[PDB]
Amino acid sequence: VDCTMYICGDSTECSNLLLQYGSFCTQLNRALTGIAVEQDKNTQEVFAQ
Amino acid sequence: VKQIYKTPPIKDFGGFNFSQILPDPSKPSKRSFIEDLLFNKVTLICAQKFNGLTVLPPLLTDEMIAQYTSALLAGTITSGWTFGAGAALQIPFAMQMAYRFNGIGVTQNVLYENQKLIANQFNSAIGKIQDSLSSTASALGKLQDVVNQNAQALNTLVKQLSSNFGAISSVLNDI
Amino acid sequence: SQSIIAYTMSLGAENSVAYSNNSIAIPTNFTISVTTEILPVSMTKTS
Amino acid sequence: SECVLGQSKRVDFCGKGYHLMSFPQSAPHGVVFLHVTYVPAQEKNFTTAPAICHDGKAHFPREGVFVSNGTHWFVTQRNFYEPQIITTDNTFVSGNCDVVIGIVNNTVYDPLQPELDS
Amino acid sequence: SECVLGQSKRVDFCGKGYHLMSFPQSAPHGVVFLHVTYVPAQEKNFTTA
Numbered sequence: 067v068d069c070t071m072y073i074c075g076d077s078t079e080c081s082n083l084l085l086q087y088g089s090f091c092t093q094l095n096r097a098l099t100g101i102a103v104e105q106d107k108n109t110q111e112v113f114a115q
Numbered sequence: 116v117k118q119i120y121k122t123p124p125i126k127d128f129g130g131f132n133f134s135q136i137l138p139d140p141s142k143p144s145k146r147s148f149i150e151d152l153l154f155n156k157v158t159l160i161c162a163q164k165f166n167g168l169t170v171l172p173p174l175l176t177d178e179m180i181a182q183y184t185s186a187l188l189a190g191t192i193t194s195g196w197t198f199g200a201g202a203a204l205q206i207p208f209a210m211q212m213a214y215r216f217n218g219i220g221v222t223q224n225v226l227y228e229n230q231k232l233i234a235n236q237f238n239s240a241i242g243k244i245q246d247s248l249s250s251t252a253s254a255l256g257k258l259q260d261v262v263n264q265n266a267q268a269l270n271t272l273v274k275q276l277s278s279n280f281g282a283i284s285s286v287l288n289d290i
Numbered sequence: 291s292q293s294i295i296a297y298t299m300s301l302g303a304e305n306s307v308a309y310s311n312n313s314i315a316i317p318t319n320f321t322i323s324v325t326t327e328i329l330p331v332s333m334t335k336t337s
Numbered sequence: 338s339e340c341v342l343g344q345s346k347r348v349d350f351c352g353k354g355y356h357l358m359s360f361p362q363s364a365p366h367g368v369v370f371l372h373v374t375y376v377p378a379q380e381k382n383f384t385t386a387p388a389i390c391h392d393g394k395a396h397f398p399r400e401g402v403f404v405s406n407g408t409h410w411f412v413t414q415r416n417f418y419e420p421q422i423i424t425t426d427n428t429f430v431s432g433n434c435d436v437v438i439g440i441v442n443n444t445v446y447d448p449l450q451p452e453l454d455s
Numbered sequence: 456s457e458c459v460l461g462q463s464k465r466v467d468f469c470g471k472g473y474h475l476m477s478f479p480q481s482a483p484h485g486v487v488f489l490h491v492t493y494v495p496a497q498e499k500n501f502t503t504a
């Protein structure tokens with residue numbers, strides 16, 4: 067999920083306002099990427115034995 | 116393990132070599148060569164004291180954990196599985212390996228037929244794992260990844276304070 | 291006068307197993323021990 | 338499923354010691370297991386050898402270990418001291434004793450002579 | 456509990472192959488297990504009944 071897009075729909079002002087909040091979007095994106103990598107690793111370990 | 120076991124001063128295990136896994140008395144730190152390599156391999160640690168963050172000390176110092184591991188190793192070498200299920204019972208390492216071979220379905224006699232071959236293979240495997248750990252940097256990926264994740268989480272938490280959230284400045288006193 | 295004392299913990303009692311290439315310890319008597327193991331199953335569920 | 342409905346070979350799973358059986362009991366939002374475990378109590382020094390040579394052929398215990406009460410040699414269970422006279426039934430033959438290190442010459446009784454004595 | 460204090464009969468639990476014993480080792484916030492495993496090496500055809 068693109069945090070910037072979901073919170074702000076192609077809006078410059080909303081993006082500027084969110085930039086002040088901090089690194090919430092980066093943290094959420096990192097968590098989602100880690101979840102996806104964990105799913106891939108689970109599939110590999112369960113099947114590729 | 117309730118008790119603490121130590122190997123005898125003389126190491127005569129029928130050709131088996133455990134020097135690479137037992138503690139080294141010479142060095143001030145009583146840790147094995149593999150343990151020393153693992154400790155050296157791992158490298159945002161001392162900077163974690165600025166704004167209320169504190170790192171509570173580990174209850175079990177690395178020396179105590181090393182002592183526990185050494186006791187487990189000595190018990191396994193001198194007695195086998197007996198010390199883990201009651202009173203520790205001594206037994207030659209050759210006979211312990213024979214018991215293991217019987218456990219995995221292989222006949223006892225084979226081990227006594229070429230005990231030297233098994234001892235040499237075990238020593239070679241120990242050396243091979245030592246070399247692989249020395250020459251490979253991704254072996255300890257799990258612990259380094261966990262440490263990096265914790266460090267970056269702490270850094271993000273600290274940096275979140277910089278956000279002003281619409282205020283003139285993030286400093287409470289100034290605003 | 292008993293009081294509070296701080297000390298470095300001892301990780302058990304040191305033991306020196308009499309190990310040699312031709313020595314074994316075969317037990318002669320046994321015991322039956324009953325040990326308790328507590329395991330939560332559910333929790334104080336609420337809505 | 339494991340400790341109660343069967344015997345678990347896992348170490349320190351159904352309590353400390355050699356698990357024999359377990360008994361479940363209820364408790365408020367929890368369960369209690371009374372793991373029964375066999376545990377060796379009394380030990381004793383013994384002199385053991387990997388195998389026994391009788392007539393140039395190595396002898397290995399079929400199920401047990403060789404021990405000695407100072408002078409005589411017997412074959413006993415690993416987890417209990419039940420010495421038995423060495424016999425062809427107790428131990429199985431293999432190769433020759435010139436290869437193994439630690440083997441000690443010993444005599445093994447044969448029932449054939451007393452059987453033919455009549 | 457299983458690999459070190461005993462011989463594990465589980466498959467691919469204490470290292471791939473017929474497990475024999477393991478040697479624990481400490482590490483910063485972690486443990487390392489050196490699982491020893493018997494593995495067949497040389498095979499041959501055989502006529503069996």
Ligand SMILES: *[C@@H]1O[C@H](CO)[C@@H](O[C@@H]2O[C@H](CO)[C@@H](O)[C@H](O)[C@H]2NC(C)=O)[C@H](O)[C@H]1NC(C)=O
Nearest residue numbers: 404405406407408409410411412420421422423
């Ligand atoms: C080791 O055990 C053997 C078998 O019991 C002993 O041999 C016999 O022991 C009985 C004990 O009542 C004696 O009456 C016999 O005279 C023994 N036979 C022989 C040929 O000696 C043996 O004495 C034991 N040795 C030790 C040191 O305990």
Ligand SMILES: *[C@@H]1O[C@H](CO)[C@@H](O)[C@H](O)[C@H]1NC(C)=O
Nearest residue numbers: 126127130131132133134135
């Ligand atoms: C085991 O190897 C070390 C070097 O790696 C050597 O010093 C030691 O002597 C070996 N063990 C025996 C019993 O010789």
Ligand SMILES: *[C@@H]1O[C@H](CO)[C@@H](O)[C@H](O)[C@H]1NC(C)=O
Nearest residue numbers: 204205308315380381382383
């Ligand atoms: C074996 O003998 C040694 C010394 O002779 C003794 O310290 C040890 O306790 C004996 N074995 C057992 C299981 O007690």
Ligand SMILES: *[C@@H]1O[C@H](CO)[C@@H](O)[C@H](O)[C@H]1NC(C)=O
Nearest residue numbers: 495496497498499500501502
């Ligand atoms: C068994 O025989 C087949 C065909 O004869 C051969 O391909 C195979 O390699 C043999 N087994 C082994 C372990 O080589």
